[PDB]
Design a protein around this ligand. Sequence first.
Ligand code: SF4
Ligand code: ZN
Ligand code: ZN
Ligand code: ZN
Ligand code: ZN
Lengths: 167, 754, 351
Amino acid sequence: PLLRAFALSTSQKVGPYNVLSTIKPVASSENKVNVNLSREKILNIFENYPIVKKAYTDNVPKNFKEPEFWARFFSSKLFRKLRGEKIMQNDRGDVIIDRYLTLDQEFDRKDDDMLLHPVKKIIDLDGNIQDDPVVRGNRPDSDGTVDILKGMNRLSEKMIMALKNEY
Amino acid sequence: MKFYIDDLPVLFPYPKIYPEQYNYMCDIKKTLDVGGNSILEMPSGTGKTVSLLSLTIAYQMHYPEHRKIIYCSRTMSEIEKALVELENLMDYRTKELGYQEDFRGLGLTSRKNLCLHPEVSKERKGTVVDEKCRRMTNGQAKRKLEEDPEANVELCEYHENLYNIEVEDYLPKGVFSFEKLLKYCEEKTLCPYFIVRRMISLCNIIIYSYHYLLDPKIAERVSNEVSKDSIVIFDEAHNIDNVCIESLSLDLTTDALRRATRGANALDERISEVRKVDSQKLQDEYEKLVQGLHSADILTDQEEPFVETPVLPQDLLTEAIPGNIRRAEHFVSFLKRLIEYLKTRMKVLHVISETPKSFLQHLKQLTFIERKPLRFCSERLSLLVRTLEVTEVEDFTALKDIATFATLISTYEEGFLLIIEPYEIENAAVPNPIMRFTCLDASIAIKPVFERFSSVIITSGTISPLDMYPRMLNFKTVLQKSYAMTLAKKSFLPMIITKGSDQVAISSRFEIRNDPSIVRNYGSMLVEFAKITPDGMVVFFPSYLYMESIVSMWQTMGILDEVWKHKLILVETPDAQETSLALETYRKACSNGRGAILLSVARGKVSEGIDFDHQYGRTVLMIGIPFQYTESRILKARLEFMRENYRIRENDFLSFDAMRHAAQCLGRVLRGKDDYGVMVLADRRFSRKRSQLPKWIAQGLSDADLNLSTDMAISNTKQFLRTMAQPTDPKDQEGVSVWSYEDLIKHQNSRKDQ
Amino acid sequence: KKRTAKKNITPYQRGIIRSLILTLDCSEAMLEKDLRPNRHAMIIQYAIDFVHEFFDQNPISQMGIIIMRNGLAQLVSQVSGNPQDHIDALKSIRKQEPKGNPSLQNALEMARGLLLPVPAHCTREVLIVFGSLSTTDPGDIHQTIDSLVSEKIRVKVLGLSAQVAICKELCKATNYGDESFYKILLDETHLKELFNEAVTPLPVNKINKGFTLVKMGFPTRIFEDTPTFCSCHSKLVYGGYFCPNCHSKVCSLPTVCPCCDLMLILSTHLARSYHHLMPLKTFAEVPTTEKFRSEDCFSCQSRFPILKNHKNGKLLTSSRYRCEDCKQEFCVDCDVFIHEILHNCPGCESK
Ligand code: SF4
Ligand SMILES: [Zn+2]
Ligand SMILES: [Zn+2]
Ligand SMILES: [Zn+2]
Ligand SMILES: [Zn+2]
């Protein structure tokens, strides 16, 4: 029983969820060295987002990702994810940052593609809207930020699916 | 249960009952006894669907006359809601009775949500899918295939298996909800669409959306076999008038006009090439015009009809030749003149609105083209295309747009009104003139059904006041009754949060813009609620642009970070597919641990049919009160018609509409009486409208709960949530408000027979 | 105006042996200000009280304590039958402060692992004192719930000021469907009585399950003092017990023999059980004007009976709440005392 107890106390994966997210939102202050849960937070990032893990790995032999890597990461990612399109301002999203940006774009795209179920016909808003008729309405209810909304949707659904995974 | 209504066995599927349901049954039966309409507001807190279906099924299956039932829920979502519930009722009825069913009842929506052909249904836009199924199984491509066996013609073959076995007989016996129908007809490889569509002649009770009833462009196949006498039920009828109007209005944009120009050029090419190849058939069709309206193949068309008849169903149509239009080249020239006149009138400087008669005379002035030939343009174009047996329609979409416009503006009068807005002021001073055309009188679209059917019902969990509808729709009623939520407990907390913490009156009325006082106030409200309510919360902004700006600059502040820290956010976005996906994830999160917030638009698709049960909704909000005149003056024109034709002033009608949508939003958060949930509002103006609300909402909204600040609001709702959480189940006070199995109703009201 | 239980309708079976694994909640939520110090301090205090009580009334069971910090379930007391260990563990915790989010799933899985060794006749249980309004699971939960109900593990949880759907599902699921075990509180006193009612064994209507004879033996106290010597903690202890069969000393306990591993008890534990099995019929409150009985107490001798016609005072009631089978009176204090502390009904004993 001591062995069983120990083993269970060991292999105890923390949840994804908050800390996973938070690693992009709830983590905007400590611009110093290795912040809180440094290794823990970065691994939460890696499981949370492949792109940053890949970029950091690619930038091991040169360009240290400790201070300068994370400094440029602030600009690049924390503009890419999270808040609005920085577009202008500090466009430090360079080299690996920009490359991974380009990647992650279509990457999240293909992920979203990999997400589409044929939802059970109670909720099927798609078949619900307009796909009964062929009608002529009006519509009257300005780009950007729609991407923000898709971002939060995509984050949440990725989280939940990483949990339906039954890993 | 199996009680009686002094003649009617009622196989109500539940052991329990509700009192309001019993009153509902009594009164709806009383209606069906004597031909009337008798709108009935039954709060959605109960089960209106169960009562409706149970009583009506029992009536139809007990008396020998009213053999058919028509049920028109607003959207296919509620279509399948009624369907699944009806299926469960049917199973219960058989179970209690054995087998005395012989019953069929079918849903009916459209191809896009039914076509099972893999490649065909892979398409997105519903019109395209319709066209594809038409070509793949038409009266003509079949001939091309059979006479000429070749790779050119393929087929769903589902239509073929139908042709083999289904059109001799029917589906086995069930009231197939779309889940069941799709599964079965996938197994037996059928085409569900044509199945139900042909089946209409046999279903005991039919459920289809409003459009199929009022949209004349698809309400064509109404085969008086369907009723001729039937009992007809409008569920969720508070949004009727807008369905009529949207079924009769029409839009025009110069770009579509140029599209029509291109289509006309393609038409010239097609007519040239075919008359080079074959014109004798064209002259034969000339003769078939000269004999009459060509109903023999302009109407006796199992698969043909191309351009629908946007005019009312053939009532306002003549049958002679369209005179000179008999010549196809003549017709193309007519459309050329029409489109050019439309273009030049489109280049008009500023806003201008005209009666259809005035515009008609003006066209006559510029080009003497008469009304009578003009009316026939729709079927003329359609059957001309059939004679052309074209390979595609996309080139002719604008052509059919213009045909519809011509037919409408040439047919009706003194109820409609044109308007030519040269731009969109929200991005004013740009090239975008729109030839907006719309109706004003809602009664026009309805009038045929109230003419046709005798016994009709109107029902919603929200209708108020119960007199605006007789006014607008101009129809006679008998029983205009409202039902009160007899509850042994509070069960929900309407509030009016007029003042935030700053004790400042708030709304969305000021602009569609920012005013950081208002923004910060709302954000505080939202976040404290997100802290306090358990899983599941909704909000209903008054308009989409409003939400876009508000949330954008909420994200500007840190406000969204906190609600992120507590619950999930799931926004509402214009594309329907992503919306459905977000909504289902919202449900999945609510029933899971993490609480989740869905924020949508009151006018939007979400409020229309989606339901919010116990878990999925606790605390709706109404950020602001929904109003429309943000945008242009089409409402102004319709309201002008309203004031002149009905003794109704502007703000009266506007408030009425706003409270209509508010009540429709609010009612969603309850399903049974076990459910519960806060229903806050937020605006200064709400306080005076307390009487506009539906009764059962008003009762719970005591006087002391008016213009509360956010802080006292949070206090009260905290106390509520705690109190409701208690298992307050005396089960003897529930003998008052549940009328238990077979007895308390029997005893109580069999004595109340006084 | 009375607040009484109408009748007890499982006075035939209970789980006498138990292995209850209380799981606290030490997570950022428990730091709000609704209960006097906080949620957390009051919680742990009452937890100590409940530990004492439960190990009294069920003195043959075990218990283990589990926290939920930072989304992790960290065992703070092995499943053991000595109250003092758990008491000390809770003492230690109370000086430590919560963090992270409550990971209900992890705690559940840790429990299910923990209760495996418990034998078939012993009965399992968990008692989630869930305080927050969310969880944070690293896996499917319904998977775990299904595994649970597969392992015959009843669960009762005491939510704080809300109702969480998943917890309601959890209680409804494991307890053979019959939902009564998700009671949540609305006041501190309600909380005290919540723990109190958690103390007793738990019947609903037991499915016909295996009922099994269990080997055990009783010890005999020892005499010598200087010969202090212990075989369960390897110390010098001035005198203890002897396993009748293993025949080795064991420091004072109802513990299991650490040599031949058979349960040890005296009897008084069995006496507590007897008290729980077959309780009394709830004492009836005599009719106000129809009693015409003796004007005293019976078990005690109280002078609180009536007042004989006093407008509203006599119209109130007649403090004569009298038990059924012996049909003798008893003042309110005596009836409360009998039905709470000592369950031999005074008169019903005597005949
Ligand atoms: S009804 Fe048949 S042919 Fe038509 S779209 Fe559906 S599956 Fe294809
Ligand atoms: Zn010892
Ligand atoms: Zn021993
Ligand atoms: Zn006494
Ligand atoms: Zn007695």
